[PDB]
Amino acid sequence: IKKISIEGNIAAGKSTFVNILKQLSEDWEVVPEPVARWSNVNVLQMMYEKPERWSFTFQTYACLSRIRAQLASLNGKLDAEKPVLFFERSVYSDRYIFASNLYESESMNETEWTIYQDWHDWMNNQFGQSLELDGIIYLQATPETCLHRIYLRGRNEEQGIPLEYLEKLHYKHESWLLHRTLKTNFDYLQEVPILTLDVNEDFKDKYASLVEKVKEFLSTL
Amino acid sequence: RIKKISIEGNIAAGKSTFVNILKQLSEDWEVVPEPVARWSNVQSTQDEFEELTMSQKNGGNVLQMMYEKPERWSFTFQTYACLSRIRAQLASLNGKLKDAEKPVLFFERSVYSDRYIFASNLYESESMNETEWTIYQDWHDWMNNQFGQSLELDGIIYLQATPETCLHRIYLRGRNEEQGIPLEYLEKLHYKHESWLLHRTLKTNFDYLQEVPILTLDVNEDFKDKYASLVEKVKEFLSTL
Ligand SMILES: Nc1ncnc2c1ncn2[C@@H]1O[C@H](COP(=O)(O)OP(=O)(O)O)[C@@H](O)[C@H]1O
Ligand SMILES: Nc1ncnc2c1ncn2[C@@H]1O[C@H](COP(=O)(O)OP(=O)(O)O)[C@@H](O)[C@H]1O
Ligand SMILES: Nc1ncnc2c1ncn2[C@H]1C[C@H](O)[C@@H](CO)O1
Ligand SMILES: Nc1ncnc2c1ncn2[C@H]1C[C@H](O)[C@@H](CO)O1
Secondary structure, rough: OEEEEOOOOOOOOOHHHHHHHOOOOOOOEEOOOHHHHHHHHOOHHHHHOOOOHHHHHHHHHHHHHHHHHHHHOOOOOOOOOOOOOEEEHHHHHHHHHHHHHHHHHOOHHHHHHHHHHHHHHHHHHHHHHHHHOOOHHHOHHHHHHHHHHHHHOHHHOOOOOHHHHHHHHHHHHHHHHHOOOOOOOOOOHOOOOOOEOOOOOOOOOOOHHHHHHHHOOOOOO | OEEEEEEEOOOOOHHHHHHHHHHHHOOEEEEEEOHHHHHOOOOOOOOHHHHHOOOOOOOHHHHHHHHHHHHHHHHHHHHHHHHHHHHHHHHHHHHOOOOOOOOEEEEEHHHHHHHHHHHHHHHHHOOOHHHHHHHHHHHHHHHHHOOOOOOOOOEEEEEEHEEEEEEEEHHHHOOOHHHOHHHHHHHHHHHHHHHHHHOOOOOOOHHHHHOEEEEEEEEOHHHHHHHHHHHHHHHHHHHOO
């Protein structure tokens, strides 16, 4: 099973795009972010209201529900010829973008962070080899595109998110995936291929061509 | 084929003492310490390069933090306490007792203590809200459907001391973080272990526990008074298995 992680900032349109991709082939399946599991255990609203209190509790639940659902979809599903499983984001995104960001903003203290890294390290050392990515698709949209789209989706918990939060997360994604300067202690990720895609335009325009590029990206793998 | 024996009892019941002495009777016996030292000095792993120039910094005390503000730090504590426990138990399960004839691996507390005794109590005491309590049980259960089976106990030895003995032995031990624990906290935990291990009425999400053999030992006495009898009882206990 070839595993692809779909990465991008909030409301760039990763659920939109991946849902579109699933249909191209029967050999293609998707692992969504468990946002409904998060809305009703509402830990998402809690952390966004009180980031200094609920940040670590969120990252734990977040990453845990992601590991669970990524593993459930390999342990079952697909006799498929050349199967691909696309992940809405990854364990690497949780830790080196969001959790790292919250730390950098002081919504996690040194203790919380250290515990979070030690849990991430262990949690991932049990599997890791099992959920290792073969490729990344970085959906690239500006902070402002992403602020507009948050308003379009209309989710109640995210309406307060300031642009400056999004710029931050945007800088982390560019550093990790475009400049490739961010260091994870998973050194295979340095030899993982990355398809960057501009998705700033309205999907009425340019969009469908992107999907043709993806069929391509997954020929070389 | 390693028999796993969990060693349970309240705080300062004397579990560390009894089982680290008890293990000298056999080379086929080894003990997995409760990783308390990791909880009072929290550290994550260092980069392969960073560690040649950087010291492993002394972390925070998430054990003190939890005592000082349980409604803030109970969830974070339970989560790490359980992770570190599992990690050590599994590591010694894969690690020790190669050339061993009748191996017994004695655990200091279990993953079930942390959930059904300690966390259960912080919930009940309102130190963890429903979300925290629900997130935690969801993690615990998952963790148990993986590495469990590999962790199943063959027995439990319950070292029974009065809340008052525990409190005394807390002062004796002199552990800084625990010095302001009131008798009432120890009372509640005593009660939880009674229901689990003596009366066996406490309702669990793991059925085999209802069947697991339990040896109850009274360790209120000065160590040397009952030592002879306790070792007798224990050995007559491992043979039933
Ligand atoms: N290219 C696009 N053009 C116009 N709207 C888009 C585009 N991509 C996504 N959207 C819309 O913006 C919102 C956020 O997209 P979504 O796929 O939910 O993002 P994510 O899952 O990455 O948070 C949704 O309303 C979606 O319909
Ligand atoms: N039977 C005993 N009589 C007098 N002191 C004891 C006895 N058993 C243990 N102690 C002391 O009580 C303290 C707590 O013991 P410890 O073995 O750390 O308990 P636990 O491991 O259950 O927390 C230590 O000072 C230990 O030396
Ligand atoms: N690992 C994470 N840490 C903090 N926040 C996260 C994380 N993953 C997803 N989110 C947020 C982004 C959107 O608000 C919403 C949709 O995924 O959930
Ligand atoms: N699972 C737990 N939950 C809350 N506290 C715990 C737990 N395990 C140990 N302790 C505390 C009690 C003693 O201070 C000391 C002995 O390990 O650490």
